[PDB]
Amino acid sequence: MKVEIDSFSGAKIYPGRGTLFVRGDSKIFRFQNSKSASLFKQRKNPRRIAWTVLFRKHHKKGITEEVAKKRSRKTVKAQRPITGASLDLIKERRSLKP
Amino acid sequence: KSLYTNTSRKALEEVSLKWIDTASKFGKGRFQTPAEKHAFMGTLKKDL
Amino acid sequence: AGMTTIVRDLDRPGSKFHKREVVEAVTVVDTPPVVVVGVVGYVETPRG
Amino acid sequence: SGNGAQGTKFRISLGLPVGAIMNCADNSGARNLYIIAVKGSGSRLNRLPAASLGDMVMATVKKGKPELRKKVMPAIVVRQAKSWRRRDGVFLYFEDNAGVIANPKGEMKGSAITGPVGKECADLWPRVASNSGVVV
Amino acid sequence: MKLNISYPVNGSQKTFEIDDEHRIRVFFDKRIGQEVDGEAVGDEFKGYVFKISGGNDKQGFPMKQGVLLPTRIKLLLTKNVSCYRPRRDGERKRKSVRGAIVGPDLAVLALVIVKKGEQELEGLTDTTVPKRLGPKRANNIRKFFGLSKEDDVRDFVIRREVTKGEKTYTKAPKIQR
RNA sequence: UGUACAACGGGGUAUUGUAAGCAGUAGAGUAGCCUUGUUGUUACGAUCUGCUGAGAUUAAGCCUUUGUUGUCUGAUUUGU
RNA sequence: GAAUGUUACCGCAAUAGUAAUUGAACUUAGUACGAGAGGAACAGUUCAUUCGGAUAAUUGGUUUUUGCGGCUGUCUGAUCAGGCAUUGCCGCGAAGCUACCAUCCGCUGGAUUAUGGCUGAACGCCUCUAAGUCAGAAUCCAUGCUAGAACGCGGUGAUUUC
RNA sequence: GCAGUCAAGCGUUCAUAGCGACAUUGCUUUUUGAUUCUUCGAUGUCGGCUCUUCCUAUCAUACCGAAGCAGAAUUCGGUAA
RNA sequence: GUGAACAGCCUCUAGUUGAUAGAAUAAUGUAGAUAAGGGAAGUCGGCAAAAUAGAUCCGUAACUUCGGGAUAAGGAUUGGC
Ligand SMILES: O[C@H]1[C@H]2c3cc4c(cc3CN3CCC(=C[C@@H]1O)[C@H]23)OCO4
Ligand SMILES: [Mg+2]
Ligand SMILES: [Mg+2]
Ligand SMILES: [Mg+2]
Ligand SMILES: [Mg+2]
Ligand SMILES: [Mg+2]
Ligand SMILES: [Mg+2]
Ligand SMILES: [Mg+2]
Ligand SMILES: [Mg+2]
Ligand SMILES: [Mg+2]
Ligand SMILES: [Mg+2]
Ligand SMILES: [Mg+2]
Ligand SMILES: [Mg+2]
Ligand SMILES: [Mg+2]
Ligand SMILES: [Mg+2]
Ligand SMILES: [Mg+2]
Ligand SMILES: [Mg+2]
Ligand SMILES: [Mg+2]
Ligand SMILES: [Mg+2]
Ligand SMILES: [Mg+2]
Ligand SMILES: [Mg+2]
Ligand SMILES: [Mg+2]
Ligand SMILES: [Mg+2]
Ligand SMILES: [Mg+2]
Ligand SMILES: [Mg+2]
Ligand SMILES: [Mg+2]
Ligand SMILES: [Mg+2]
Ligand SMILES: [Mg+2]
Ligand SMILES: [Mg+2]
Ligand SMILES: [Mg+2]
Ligand SMILES: [Mg+2]
Ligand SMILES: [Mg+2]
Ligand SMILES: [Mg+2]
Ligand SMILES: [Mg+2]
Ligand SMILES: [Mg+2]
Ligand SMILES: [Mg+2]
Ligand SMILES: [Mg+2]
Ligand SMILES: [Mg+2]
Ligand SMILES: [Mg+2]
Ligand SMILES: [Mg+2]
Ligand SMILES: [Mg+2]
Ligand SMILES: [Mg+2]
Ligand SMILES: [Mg+2]
Ligand SMILES: [Mg+2]
Ligand SMILES: [Mg+2]
Ligand SMILES: [Mg+2]
Ligand SMILES: [Mg+2]
Ligand SMILES: [Mg+2]
Ligand SMILES: [Mg+2]
Ligand SMILES: [Mg+2]
Ligand SMILES: [Mg+2]
Ligand SMILES: [Mg+2]
Ligand SMILES: [Mg+2]
Ligand SMILES: [Mg+2]
Ligand SMILES: [Mg+2]
Ligand SMILES: [Mg+2]
Ligand SMILES: [Mg+2]
Ligand SMILES: [Mg+2]
Ligand SMILES: [Mg+2]
Ligand SMILES: [Mg+2]
Ligand SMILES: [Mg+2]
Ligand SMILES: [Mg+2]
């Protein structure tokens, strides 16, 4: 059971919900309801329609904390050396000096 | 209680739901739960 | 109470939709425990 | 349906009653198909027979090669535009009405199908399956 | 679906199989790069953090970082780009590609270990595979040992032994620069 | 005279598509005063942007309610 | 809807009505039969047609929600906010109503006809028939379903005092 | 218009599987005629649309008997509206 | 005022605010609208209804009494500032 999304507005289309439009070129357009569906038939441009995701994404509306930082990093430092070349005499010769 | 024991196949089938719709019936509902709606919408002028 | 929608797999060997999801409408009736307040005994008569 | 239709077909909303004209979406020479009958459909005072995805109709070619015109041949419906609903719950619809001319056994006259095809038709007739690109 | 896990500290790898929507479900709607806590996917991996690095759906098309979408598309690809190896100077081929968002269609999810949970995973933590090649350029030896332009490399180049049945040989690189 | 009832108010749910007001280095541009500009200044300018997925509407046969306010014996008739 | 004491609740069931229909595909099976050409059916399964009774989660239609937004002409000094144009026009539009345009559901016992039979005389033989009797149909009677006799009926509650 | 009896023929052979001459007995009242009984101080004197019900001399569907029924297909007949 | 306009629509002056009334909004109506997919299959017949429409530009067939046919047909455009 996949939830789909509205290819005009961007709303989740839970199952059996809204309509599905197979355009002449076989591009497919899932609507959640007759609103998106008519705007869409009306050659309306989702980027100019305030309540749409596509609008909001492009107008930077209330994203706020996604542009807020995070903490996802690591810390390793494990010697393996070089196969066939004694990974033994490769840390004792690795004593350095500076 | 049915007045006969149907064999049918159609009866006998042992269903088990995967998902029960729960979005509003008072409109073109988009959200199962307030939690879902809150998730997807972001934060509103009311709220916290 | 009303109706909602359901999603479940189908178990119907032979059908094109065997082992595929189907979506189906269901009704819901509110069903709080009934309470027993009496018994009544009937007899058979040639008038029924 | 009937002949050469291997498989069954779940009922799908009738969209093309007799007199409908669908785009001819093969490469046979025919540009359109004029529906004159629907195979395996029944009787009711004043009901017009009507075809849906994967139906066999009898048709004529109103606009096409002259060698295809003035005669009745079979055809198969491949795109609807009248919204129908699958058992997976979706109401879907093409952008045009479109079938392809076929013989009683359900073999295509031409060799490509131009445009998408409904799956419920692909499923139904093998040689239509072959000549397809995008199905559904 | 099959999980292809790497532990890039030992250079370990082993695949795992997971047949449980719930145990799987964790990775869904996750993109490439997002981190994933472990216990959800099994008890073996409790604590273990996984970075999602790619994978192939059934049909075997590969993911492509940053497409978003949990579907397939067909892109124009160029030189220096994933899921494409150009056959000819300035050639671009138009190829199908799978999205970078994990769905149930993936045959395999590619995963990297980033934090090692409370327990050891057999063919992974327990085994450690050595780095095939060693430093070959002048200053690189100097940095894989920290030597200062004083110490002379020629004796710090690495030496790989091998036998000719009854002749055991020795072959070091060829310090460039 | 009580998990009473009603009128409002609140909260949910829904419909539209971003209120009024204010602000702006947005705006094809335009006038006016001189101290004629090394952003000169004062305003005006369809429209745009921000506060603002805002504002409005939401049971009249939607859901709900620890708040507010009020209501809670008039009439007629019936017997083996 | 008056009157069978009043009133209330729960029931019975006389009589009357009654409903389901047809096709295909898979499979049987390239089988039985056939020199060949060709070429079935019962059981099983999946769908369909025509009909019927509902129902509105979904989709679609409807729009005075005159709900939100947009537009022309004018009128209120402007602004805000509105009026008028037999519902001014347009896009969306909840609720309701609604569509093989949408979804869901449509029962199983018996007795029989034709007909094929048993046993069996008439008529020492023979006969399904004369006595007696088995099997049997989209039939019929029930089961189920809808009314419920306003002059058919049962069980049960409470039955007025100024 | 519909259904019989006789059985000369037809059907390779074979009257009656399926048919059937010369004759002949009937039934029907969506044919057309014959009549002129009712209506001329008026019974709306084509067809279609809609919609109910009824007949059966049954086209389909249920179950049957028969065949010049190998199968498939068909034809004849019964119970059947 | 809009506009080509004595059109339609809204306004000033003047004049009306007369037309039994209340409550509901069943069927069937009269009058006003809309309808997915199909597009005359309806019907004697496209009856009814729908479509078209102003202006500016571009473009314009047969045939002809040379005057026409002609807004032929077919197209694009149109607000505000
Ligand atoms: O009424 C007369 C007939 C009649 C007379 C008419 C007329 C119509 C009729 C109708 N016919 C049916 C049987 C009838 C019997 C009578 O003779 C009627 O139109 C003008 O006069
Ligand atoms: Mg609509
Ligand atoms: Mg709607
Ligand atoms: Mg073509
Ligand atoms: Mg008709
Ligand atoms: Mg022509
Ligand atoms: Mg091929
Ligand atoms: Mg060098
Ligand atoms: Mg009150
Ligand atoms: Mg805003
Ligand atoms: Mg309050
Ligand atoms: Mg009484
Ligand atoms: Mg009395
Ligand atoms: Mg076979
Ligand atoms: Mg033979
Ligand atoms: Mg308005
Ligand atoms: Mg202002
Ligand atoms: Mg006025
Ligand atoms: Mg007027
Ligand atoms: Mg609706
Ligand atoms: Mg029906
Ligand atoms: Mg029943
Ligand atoms: Mg009986
Ligand atoms: Mg015997
Ligand atoms: Mg008998
Ligand atoms: Mg007898
Ligand atoms: Mg006898
Ligand atoms: Mg018996
Ligand atoms: Mg029956
Ligand atoms: Mg029963
Ligand atoms: Mg009674
Ligand atoms: Mg009683
Ligand atoms: Mg003779
Ligand atoms: Mg013979
Ligand atoms: Mg002879
Ligand atoms: Mg006749
Ligand atoms: Mg007369
Ligand atoms: Mg008279
Ligand atoms: Mg009369
Ligand atoms: Mg008359
Ligand atoms: Mg009778
Ligand atoms: Mg008969
Ligand atoms: Mg013979
Ligand atoms: Mg018989
Ligand atoms: Mg009948
Ligand atoms: Mg009868
Ligand atoms: Mg006067
Ligand atoms: Mg009057
Ligand atoms: Mg009145
Ligand atoms: Mg009402
Ligand atoms: Mg229409
Ligand atoms: Mg058309
Ligand atoms: Mg006609
Ligand atoms: Mg036409
Ligand atoms: Mg006709
Ligand atoms: Mg005519
Ligand atoms: Mg005619
Ligand atoms: Mg007309
Ligand atoms: Mg229109
Ligand atoms: Mg003219
Ligand atoms: Mg002309
Ligand atoms: Mg302009």
Q: Note whether B32 contacts A33, CB cutoff 8 Å.
A: no
Q: Are E101 and E30 in contact (CB under 8 A)?
A: yes
User: Which member of B18, B22, B25 has the closest CB to residue C9?
Assistant: B18
**Residue of chain A with shortest Cα separation from B23:** A14
User: Which pair of tokens denotes residue D112?
Assistant: 């490509």
On the CB side of D6, how many CA atoms lie within 13 Å of its CA? Answer: 7
Kindly report the length of chain E.
177
**Neighbour-count burial of E54, counting CB atoms closer than 10 A to its CB (0-12 exposed, 13-18 middle, 19+ buried):** buried
Which own/partner contact pairs does A66-69 have at CB distance under 8 Å and 24+ positions apart? none
CB-based contact, C7 to chain B, within 8 Å: yes
Single-letter code of the amino acid located at A86: S
C-alpha separations of E116 from A75, E7, E31, E54 in Å: 11, 9, 21, 20
Strand partners, E72: E98
How far is the C-alpha of A85 from the C-alpha of A98, rounded, in Å?
Answer: 24
- Residues with Cβ < 8 Å from A46, sequence gap 6 or more? A8, A9, A10, A39, A52, A54, A55
- How was it solved? X-ray
Q: What is the residue range of E25's domain?
A: 1-130
How far is the C-alpha of E62 from the C-alpha of E78, rounded, in Å?
Answer: 16
Residue of D99, D28, D104, D20 lying closest to D64 (CA atoms): D28
- Residues with Cβ < 8 Å from E37, sequence gap 6 or more? E47, E49, E50
∠ at Cα D28 (D25, D34), nearest 5°?
60
**Residue of chain B with shortest Cα separation from A65:** B42
Single-letter code of the amino acid located at A64: T
How far is the C-alpha of D47 from the C-alpha of D51, rounded, in Å?
Answer: 12
Chains interfacing with E (3 or more CB pairs < 8 Å): A
DSSP-derived pairing of the beta strands E106-115 and E2-7: parallel
Give, as ranges, the nucleotides of chain G with any atom within 7 Å of a protein CB.
Answer: 10-14, 23-26, 45-51, 55-61, 91-95, 100-105, 107-108, 143-144, 152, 155
On the CB side of B20, how many CA atoms lie within 13 Å of its CA? Answer: 7
**Neighbour-count burial of E106, counting CB atoms closer than 10 A to its CB (0-12 exposed, 13-18 middle, 19+ buried):** buried
Residue-by-residue DSSP string for E103-160: -TTEEEEEEEEEE--SS--IIIII--PPPS----BHHHHHHTTT-TTTS-STTTS--E
Determine the distance in angstroms separating the CA of A2 from the nearest CA of chain B, rounded to an integer.
11
Q: In chain C, what residues touch A15 (CB-CB under 8 Å)?
A: 5, 7, 21, 23
Q: Are D16 and D35 in contact (CB under 8 A)?
A: yes
E52: enclosing H helix or E strand: strand E49-57
Q: Are D9 and D39 in contact (CB under 8 A)?
A: no
Residue of A14, E6, D103 lying closest to C7 (CA atoms): A14
Q: Note whether A12 contacts B42, CB cutoff 8 Å.
A: no
Does residue D46 lie within 7 Å of nucleic acid chain H, judged by its CB?
yes
Q: Note whether C16 contacts D89, CB cutoff 8 Å.
A: no
Cα-to-centroid distance, C24 and ligand 22 (Å): 24
Spacing of B21 CA from G1 C1' in Å: 50
CB-based contact, D114 to chain A, within 8 Å: no
Cα-to-centroid distance, D44 and ligand 41 (Å): 28
Q: Are A6 and A30 in contact (CB under 8 A)?
A: yes
- Residues with Cβ < 8 Å from E144, sequence gap 6 or more? E134, E135
How far is the C-alpha of E114 from the C-alpha of E153, rounded, in Å?
Answer: 34
Q: In chain A, what residues touch B31 (CB-CB under 8 Å)?
A: 12
Does residue D43 lie within 7 Å of nucleic acid chain H, judged by its CB?
no
How far is the C-alpha of E130 from the C-alpha of A84, rounded, in Å?
Answer: 9
